[PDB]
Design a protein around this ligand. Structure first.
Ligand SMILES: CCCCCCCCCCCCCCCCCC(=O)OC[C@H](COP(=O)([O-])OCC(O)COP(=O)([O-])OC[C@@H](COC(=O)CCCCCCCCCCCCCCCCC)OC(=O)CCCCCCCCCCCCCCCCC)OC(=O)CCCCCCCCCCCCCCCCC
Ligand SMILES: CCCCCCCCCCCCCCCCCC(=O)OC[C@H](COP(=O)([O-])OCC(O)COP(=O)([O-])OC[C@@H](COC(=O)CCCCCCCCCCCCCCCCC)OC(=O)CCCCCCCCCCCCCCCCC)OC(=O)CCCCCCCCCCCCCCCCC
Ligand SMILES: CC(C)=CCC/C(C)=C/CC/C(C)=C\CC/C(C)=C/CC/C(C)=C/CC/C(C)=C/CC/C(C)=C/CC/C(C)=C/CC/C(C)=C/CC1=C(C)C(=O)c2ccccc2C1=O
Ligand SMILES: CC(C)=CCC/C(C)=C/CC/C(C)=C\CC/C(C)=C/CC/C(C)=C/CC/C(C)=C/CC/C(C)=C\CC/C(C)=C\CC/C(C)=C/CC1=C(C)C(=O)c2ccccc2C1=O
Ligand SMILES: CCCCCCCCCCCCCCCC(=O)O[C@H](COC(=O)CCCCCCC[C@@H](C)CCCCCCCCC)COP(=O)(O)O[C@H]1[C@H](O)[C@H](O)[C@H](O)[C@@H](O)[C@@H]1O
Ligand SMILES: CCCCCCCC/C=C\CCCCCCCC(=O)OC[C@H](COP(=O)(O)OCCN)OC(=O)CCCCCCCCCCCCCCC
Ligand code: HEC
Ligand code: HEC
Ligand code: HEM
Ligand code: HEM
Ligand SMILES: COc1ccn2nc(C)c(C(=O)NCc3ccc(N4CCC(c5ccc(OC(F)(F)F)cc5)CC4)cc3)c2c1
Ligand code: FES
Lengths: 185, 139, 218, 75, 105, 524
């Protein structure tokens, strides 16, 4: 019974709504870039590209690791799932720490939220993505703790799958934000 | 499912058409060029409907006929055992109370209230997720 | 170019006349006269943002030396107090910090702590009104605040509170708002209410959680 | 004292009855206490109207319960 | 010190019509409820607020209480100036100061 | 240590009382540790107070500070305030110790209140134990006043205001005795010279001694009248089911003691309480905005705030307002210890009881208790008027009137809701007794009908429906996973699996031991 999965449909439609949320943020960003003529990233601000590439590659590797974990989950063994999801958690934590470090080193000598328009839109666009990543980390921890406390049933597999492609959606919207902010300018 | 996918494809086609038309009509004939705020909303609502429609399309191509999708069928076809539908639970009201605490702590700028609200939200969501998986007590 | 208050009476006419009058006469519906007041009142009211009002503190509207413009324009119509200046013409700061924090703190506890707090947190007055926090106000704002006597706050002249007394009070306030808490995380600056809350919501939940873990339930 | 089991299932395991006269008299006394609190230093009358409005609802509820119990629609 | 603008809303309790010197009034500072310092003075409502339990006295109406468990007015002190121009007391309080007891106020 | 043990045995020969105390059985419910919490808090209080007495000087003479804390140099203060400042700033580890002391006092009070709530709601005060209830009530009163006298010792502005207002000007207002009590206690008018030494003597010697004697008597009565228990599988009014002291109970008690000490140390190191240096020495001319006593006197303060100004003036005399606060507080302190006798007079039940009641089986008492707790919460929140009206933007007069009206309309509303809620819980229990436990699975029953696959708790009749059980005062399961339904995860560590033989053996022996425990406790 119930040949198409239900949790899958729910997660998919919710991810669509989240995409619309990020649409609102993008619309905020593109305006105030048309108004600032010339060096629209103001003089105290210049982005350090020597740090933003490794964290993006780390996030992509995280996506690969999560897909491997789902492959392991579809056949009923919990330990491969646990290993791949621990790896994914560690890589996401590294990404968040790198982003926070760049925030510190960038607020150190210039750009602030109340000090500019570019700084405002930049921090607003990237901090919400950071919050989404932190939520994904919490979901990973909860899923592992839940696999710890009973035998492996198909419901656990469905939960793993939906958490997986939530993570995929996250690290795709990150690619969009990165290509828009750091390269297009 | 074949009709849901077709509905979402119709919607995605119309939204993409409208987005492109608006973009190219405001590139010219407008005061300051491309409008940049309706354009974005339109492309990303197109993307929303596209994601949903593509998922439904894959699930339809990977599926055999279903008593719901199938005419010609009788009630003895669906005779079986449905999923698990949760009976009584009291965690939703606690989740809502925690989220409301965090929200009122964000309205009036009070960081301690925001921290307490976030902690309570984590606790209540953990309680909701684990409700039907805790085992018997170990003594 | 001090003979130029044509700016000044260019911003007042487009941001104030609806509530104070074209001649600074106090529209009998909303605003006071603003004649006896001086540059210090305008400085404190505008720089903190309480001015032009729809009164709480908000974001300021005017700078780029136009607070000076409105202040000079208002001073030209009366004889109120003026803002302190340093040998450059700007407004001063750190040398109004008395080498003495004991006297400043005793004066604060006698005159100021009744409405604000022991250490300058807020305090509630009757029927709405409250006394705000003293953390984000700079030195000239503190001086002009206790010199001009804003709404429902008493007015401390330079004869009952001399200039040393004011400088020492400023120094005590700025030190009390910027000192560490050498006992751990202070729970807001108030008395036993945050302490009781923290007890009930941290220590008791830890104790009851450990009691639930150790002992069985039946 | 006594209550039938079909209203309170665990009527034999503990105290489960409070006589209704207690509740009626308590409601009337609380209304009177709310009313007598117009004696003071209240300059302004915004507070007196809340006192009068909360004392009318209590009396209304008590009277409704008494009248329905008197005609057998309750118990 | 009361602003010269009002000076027409004063009520001047029955026995103390001449206890003020112009615009100076000099009430006591010990709340007539339980004895905390009633020091919160709002300058343009003319209200004195006791911070211990929040009573409110009306500085323009012989310090009459207008909110809270406070029930008796604050005591007023008579003042004047001496031959040199300093403020001096023109006598004593007409009644005891502070909380009440069995004997009298 | 055979030689030493035998020589102790020929000199004392206990060997039978030790066996009688090593075999005592104690019930194991998480709710039976709320008294241990208070006991351990009291022990920590004793230790830290004995440490503190080596540095405190309780005088009221005036000195000039001339210390290390610079923003107070040259200020004239009493000797007690200076001694407290010296403890805080000039003894290595003194601030830590006094913060532990204050946090332990707070935890003492909170644990006592939670324990009282348990005792009241479960009905553990009935026929054999009214006197133990009375002793507990006396302990509560003494703890309140001891904490008050304690935090009034290092006389600073806040403690001085509290002393002045409450003690001086409520004792001063009593109808006839009044000023006589005030002058006997203070030695004169309010700011004296004998107040702080007298409070010091009362606080370190007398009240701790009385509390220690009463705690000894309390624990003796609990030891010789064996503990109560909840109804269950093998529980009767004539036996105690639990674990023996010998290996287990002492171990659990000691581990709980260590964990409570750990929590107290952590929160005494990381959170700040009573920073007396931000205040100043007490002076009768200056005041601040907070005021506020510790959370166990806030109800007294709130009652004084929201009580209307009703005074009586007759011939040559005066009865002020705080007299009302006095009689109401006395009435509360008299109605607390005399409750079991009231309930036994009203319900007319005088039998021995050793099995507890679930709070849902006694709706009227549960509603009374909820009403009292709501009243207490209203009185406590009415004490932080200033903080509430400042942080949350509300008028001050508005909060006063909100408290003044809530004091009358919240208790009855809470009573009504609690009564209906208790009966609803009873009905929910009866439904799962009549039918089975809902599993949450749905079927379609080829003629298009939806059923929900209940699961019986006992025997079944001919046509598959379970025969209804009878209620026995014990809790019933509501979730299928609490019964063993979906369990038995893998037996790895966290990332690597174990062998299959180990997994099978461990699972199978665990199942066997569970079944044996069940079958053993049923049969007795
Ligand atoms: C001529 C014939 C006419 C034909 C008949 C026609 C019928 C109707 C037509 C009449 C026309 C009138 C129409 C006017 C509109 C009616 C208004 C109305 O709706 O009333 C509600 C009315 C109530 O229904 P009902 O028919 O009266 O129910 C029967 C009784 O409940 C049965 O229960 P009971 O009454 O026997 O129980 C008594 C109960 C009565 O309760 C009620 O029945 C309802 C009222 C309770 C509500 C709140 C509790 C009281 C708080 C007062 C302040 C509130 C603010 O008293 C209490 O227990 C309350 C607590 C008392 C506290 C006392 C403390 C005791 C301890 C002592 C210690 C000493 C300390 C001293 C200090 C303490 C101070 C006291 O009908 C409803 O709308 C609700 C029906 C059921 C609820 C469904 C969900 C409703 C959703 C809401 C939206
Ligand atoms: C204003 C608007 C009004 C708001 C309405 C009030 C909200 C109340 C929602 C919670 C209701 C809980 C409940 O009714 O459970 C029934 C519960 C037993 O249910 P049952 O179906 O018979 O199951 C018993 C069977 O033996 C079968 O038992 P079982 O083994 O199947 O499981 C039973 C359950 C044990 O059953 C319980 O007794 C649970 C007790 C939870 C108390 C609620 C906390 C408040 O097992 C547990 O031990 C799980 C809970 C472990 C500790 C609870 C963790 C709390 C997390 C808090 C995070 C959220 C922050 C709160 C909001 C933040 C800002 C406000 O009995 C009670 O009614 C407990 C009394 C609680 C009512 C007073 C609490 C609110 C008072 C005023 C609020 C303002
Ligand atoms: C006056 C009294 C008697 C009643 C007034 C209370 C009430 C009217 C206030 C809020 C009302 C509200 C907006 C109604 C709607 C809200 C409803 C839909 C659900 C949300 C309700 C929640 C958010 C209420 C919050 C609980 C709150 C009242 C308790 C506060 C506890 C104490 C007083 C706070 C003091 C306090 C504490 C406790 C700190 O820990 C702290 C830590 C660090 C810095 C400062 C502080 C601090 O000031
Ligand atoms: C059980 C009942 C009280 C017995 C009734 C017996 C008989 C009726 C005696 C008459 C007494 C009547 C007339 C007046 C009552 C008031 C008076 C007696 C006060 C004396 C003190 C004493 C009796 C205390 C009463 C019982 C006590 C309040 C138990 C409450 C605690 C229990 C039930 C639940 C606690 C659970 C806890 C771990 C989580 C709660 C989290 C927080 C929100 C608790 C709420 C909370 C509390 C409780 C604070 O005290 C508090 C103080 C300062 C700041 C904040 C808070 C605060 O947030
Ligand atoms: C009744 C007990 C109440 C507590 C005090 C004892 C009785 C009080 C009895 C009492 O009321 O007055 C007393 C009368 O003195 C006394 O006997 C001293 C106390 C001893 C009582 C009698 C001796 C016992 C045998 C005090 O009058 P006194 O402080 O001297 O003078 C006052 C003015 O201030 C004020 O102008 C006014 O004229 C009065 O307030 C006046 O009493
Ligand atoms: C709304 C959330 C918006 C964005 C979130 C992303 C945060 C982005 C983090 C980066 C911040 C930054 O780098 O900005 C440096 C500046 C220097 O300003 P300053 O004046 O010179 O310094 C003097 C400081 N007082 O500090 C700041 O504004 C402080 C930033 C405040 C932290 C962000 C607030 C998070 C609260 C979450 C809300 C949850 C509520 C849920 C209820 C429904
Ligand atoms: C009618 C809306 C309104 C506007 C617009 C407005 N004010 Fe005010 N102003 C008030 C009110 C009302 C007060 C009374 C002070 C109070 O109660 O807080 C006041 C007070 C003042 C005071 C202090 C009066 C005193 O006696 O200390 C000054 C100075 C002042 N305004 C100047 C200004 C300036 C500068 C502007 C900006 C051009 C401005 N006002 C615009 C309403 C307004
Ligand atoms: C309760 C009477 C009261 C007294 C006494 C009092 N204040 Fe105020 N204070 C207030 C009120 C009310 C305001 C708000 C005025 C406004 O917003 O226009 C205020 C505002 C201030 C501000 C502005 C705070 C800010 O962030 O802009 C400062 C600074 C200040 N007072 C300092 C002092 C000092 C120093 C003393 C002691 C000499 C003192 N106050 C005594 C009530 C008082
Ligand atoms: C038994 C219950 C007790 C309670 C509720 C209690 C409570 C308190 C409190 C709250 C303080 C304030 C501390 C501060 O603010 O710094 C205090 C001070 C003090 N306590 Fe206790 N205490 C208790 C027992 C004891 C005992 C048994 C002793 C000594 C044997 C003791 C010795 C002291 C001393 C000397 C002070 C003053 C030192 C100081 O204030 O720094 N206390 N008490
Ligand atoms: C300092 C104060 C108190 C201490 C140290 C204390 C401690 C204890 C302890 C350790 C127990 C046995 C274990 C347990 O029941 O969890 C107990 C039981 C009991 N307490 Fe308290 N308590 C105190 C206050 C009170 C109060 C305020 C009351 C009312 C009270 C009444 C009782 C009763 C009746 C029992 C017997 C419960 C039973 O036998 O099941 N005690 N107390
Ligand atoms: C800290 O800052 C602040 C700021 C503001 N407030 N406002 C208040 C109310 C407090 C505050 O501390 N309240 C707690 C409190 C309340 C009353 C007493 N009395 C003891 C003596 C008195 C008495 C009366 C009659 C007697 O007669 C007989 F002897 F019994 F016969 C005996 C004793 C009874 C009540 C003791 C403590 C406070 C604190
Ligand atoms: S002490 Fe001033 S109101 Fe009670």
């Amino acid at each position: 019974l119930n040949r198409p999965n239900m949790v899958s449909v729910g997660t998919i439609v919710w991810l669509s709504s989240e995409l619309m949320f990020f649409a609102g943020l993008f619309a905020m960003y593109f305006t105030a870039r048309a108004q600032a003529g010339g060096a629209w990233p103001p003089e105290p601000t210049e982005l350090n590209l020597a740090l933003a590439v490794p964290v993006t590659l780390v996030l992509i590797a995280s996506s690969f690791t999560c897909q491997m974990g789902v492959f392991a989950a579809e056949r009923g063994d919990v330990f491969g799932l646990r290993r791949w999801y621990v790896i994914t958690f560690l890589m996401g934590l590294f990404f968040v720490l790198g982003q926070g470090y760049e925030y510190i080193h960038l607020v150190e000598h210039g750009t602030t939220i109340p000090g500019s328009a570019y700084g405002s839109v930049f921090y607003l666009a990237t901090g919400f993505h950071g919050l989404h990543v932190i939520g994904g980390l919490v979901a990973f921890v909860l899923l592992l703790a839940r696999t710890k406390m009973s035998k492996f049933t198909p419901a656990q597999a469905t939960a793993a799958i939906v958490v997986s492609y939530y993570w995929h959606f996250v690290d795709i919207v990150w690619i969009a934000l990165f290509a828009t902010i750091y390269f297009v300018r | 499912m074949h009709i849901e996918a077709r509905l979402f494809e119709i919607l995605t086609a119309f939204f993409a058409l409208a987005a492109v038309v608006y973009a190219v009509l405001t590139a010219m004939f407008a005061t300051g060029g491309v409008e940049w705020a309706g354009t974005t909303a339109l492309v990303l609502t197109t993307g929303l409907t596209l994601i949903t429609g593509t998922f439904f399309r894959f699930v339809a191509r990977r599926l055999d006929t279903r008593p719901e999708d199938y005419e010609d069928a009788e009630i003895s076809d669906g005779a079986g055992e449905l999923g698990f539908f949760a009976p009584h639970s009291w965690w939703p009201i606690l989740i809502s109370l925690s989220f409301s605490t965090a929200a009122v702590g964000a309205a009036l700028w009070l960081p301690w209230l925001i921290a307490a609200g976030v902690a309570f939200v984590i606790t209540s969501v953990c309680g909701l997720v684990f409700e039907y998986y805790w085992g018997p007590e170990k003594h | 170019s001090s003979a130029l208050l044509r700016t000044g009476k260019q911003l007042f006419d487009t941001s104030c006349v609806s509530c104070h009058g074209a001649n600074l006469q106090g529209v009998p519906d909303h605003g006071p006269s603003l004649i006896g007041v001086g540059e210090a009142a305008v400085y404190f009211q505008v720089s903190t943002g309480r001015m032009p009002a729809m009164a709480p503190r908000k974001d300021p509207i005017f700078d780029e030396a136009q607070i000076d413009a409105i202040g000079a324009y208002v001073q030209a119509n009366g004889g109120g107090p003026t803002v302190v200046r340093n040998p450059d013409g700007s407004i001063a700061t750190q040398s109004l910090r008395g080498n003495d924090l004991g006297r400043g703190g005793d004066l604060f506890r006698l005159n100021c702590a009744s409405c604000h707090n022991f250490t300058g947190k807020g305090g509630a007055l009757s029927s709405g009104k409250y006394a705000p926090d003293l953390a984000p106000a700079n030195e000239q704002q503190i001086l002009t605040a206790m010199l001009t006597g804003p709404q429902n706050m008493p007015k401390f002249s330079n004869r009952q509170l001399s200039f040393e007394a004011k400088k020492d009070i400023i120094a005590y306030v700025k030190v009390a708002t910027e000192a560490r808490q050498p006992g751990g995380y202070l729970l807001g600056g108030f008395g036993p209410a945050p302490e009781g809350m923290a007890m009930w919501i941290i220590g008791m939940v830890a104790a009851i959680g450990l009691a639930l873990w150790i002992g069985a339930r039946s | 004292t006594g209550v039938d089991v079909e209203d309170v299932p665990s009527a034999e395991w503990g105290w489960s009855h409070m006589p209704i006269g207690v509740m009626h008299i308590g409601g009337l006394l609380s209304a009177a206490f709310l009313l007598v609190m117009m004696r003071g230093n209240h300059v302004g009358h915004v507070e007196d109207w809340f006192l009068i409005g909360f004392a009318a609802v209590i009396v209304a509820l008590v009277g409704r319960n008494w009248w329905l119990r008197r005609r057998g629609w309750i118990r | 010190r009361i602003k010269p603008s009002d000076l027409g809303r004063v009520v001047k309790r029955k026995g103390q019509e001449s206890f003020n010197f112009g615009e100076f009034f000099a009430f006591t500072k010990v709340c007539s409820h339980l004895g905390c310092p009633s020091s919160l003075y709002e300058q343009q409502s003319y209200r004195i607020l006791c911070p211990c339990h929040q009573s409110q006295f009306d500085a323009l109406h012989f310090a009459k209480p207008i909110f809270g468990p406070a029930a008796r007015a604050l005591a007023q002190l008579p003042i004047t100036i001496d031959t040199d121009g300093y403020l001096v007391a023109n006598g004593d309080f007409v009644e005891p100061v502070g909380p009440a007891f069995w004997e009298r106020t | 240590l055979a030689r030493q043990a035998e020589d102790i045995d020929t000199r004392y020969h206990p060997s039978a009382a030790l066996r009688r105390q090593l075999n005592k059985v104690f019930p194991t419910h998480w709710s039976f540790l709320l008294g241990e919490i208070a006991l351990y808090s009291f022990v920590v209080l004793l230790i830290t107070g004995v440490y503190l007495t080596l540095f405190f000087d309780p005088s009221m003479v005036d000195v000039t500070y001339n210390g290390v804390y610079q923003p107070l140099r040259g200020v004239e203060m009493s000797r007690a305030y200076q001694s407290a400042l010296d403890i805080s700033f000039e003894v290595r580890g003194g601030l830590f110790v006094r913060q532990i002391h204050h946090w332990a006092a707070l935890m003492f009070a909170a644990a006592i209140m939670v324990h009282l709530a348990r005792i009241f709601f479960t009905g553990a005060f009935r026929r054999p134990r009214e006197t133990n209830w009375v002793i507990g009530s006396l302990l509560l009163i003494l703890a309140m006043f001891e904490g008050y006298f304690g935090y009034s010792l290092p006389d600073d502005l806040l403690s001085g205001l509290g002393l002045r207002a409450a003690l001086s000007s409520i004792t001063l207002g009593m109808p006839v005795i009044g000023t006589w009590l005030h002058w006997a206690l203070f030695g004169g008018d309010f700011p004296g010279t004998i107040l702080i030494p007298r409070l010091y003597a009362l606080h370190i010697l007398l009240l701790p001694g009385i509390i220690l004697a009463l705690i000894g008597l309390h624990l003796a009565l609990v030891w010789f009248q064996k503990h109560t228990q909840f109804p269950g599988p093998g529980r009767t009014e004539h036996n105690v089911v639990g674990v023996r002291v010998m290996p287990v109970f002492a171990f659990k008690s000691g581990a709980f003691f260590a964990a409570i000490v750990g929590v107290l140390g952590l929160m005494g190191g990381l959170l700040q309480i009573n920073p007396i240096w931000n205040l100043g020495p007490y002076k009768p001319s200056q005041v601040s905005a907070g005021s506020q006593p510790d959370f166990y006197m806030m109800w007294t303060e709130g009652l004084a705030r929201i009580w209307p100004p009703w005074e009586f003036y007759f011939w040559h005399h005066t009865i002020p307002a705080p007299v009302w606060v006095a009689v109401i507080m006395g009435l509360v302190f008299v109605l607390l210890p005399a409750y079991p006798f009231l309930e036994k007079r009203f319900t007319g039940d005088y039998a021995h009881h050793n099995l507890l009641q679930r709070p849902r089986d006694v709706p009227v008492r549960t509603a009374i208790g909820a009403m009292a707790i709501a009243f207490y919460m209203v009185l406590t929140l009415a004490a932080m008027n200033d903080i509430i009206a400042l942080k949350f933007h509300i008028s001050l007069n508005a909060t006063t009137w909100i408290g003044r009206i809530g004091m009358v309309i919240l208790p009855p509303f809470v009573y009504f809701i609690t009564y209906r809620w208790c009966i609803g819980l009873q009905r929910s229990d009866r439904s799962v007794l009549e039918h089975g436990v809902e599993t949450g699975i749905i079927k379609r029953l080829p003629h298009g009908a939806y059923i929900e696959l209940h699961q019986p708790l006992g025997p079944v009749d001919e046509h598959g429906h379970p025969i209804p059980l009878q209620y026995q005062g014990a809790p019933l399961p509501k979730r299928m996973n609490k019964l063993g339904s979906a369990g038995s995860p893998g037996s790895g560590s966290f990332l690597f699996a174990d062998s299959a033989a180990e997994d099978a053996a461990l699972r199978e022996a665990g199942h066997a031991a569970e079944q044996r425990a069940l079958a053993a406790l049923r049969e007795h």
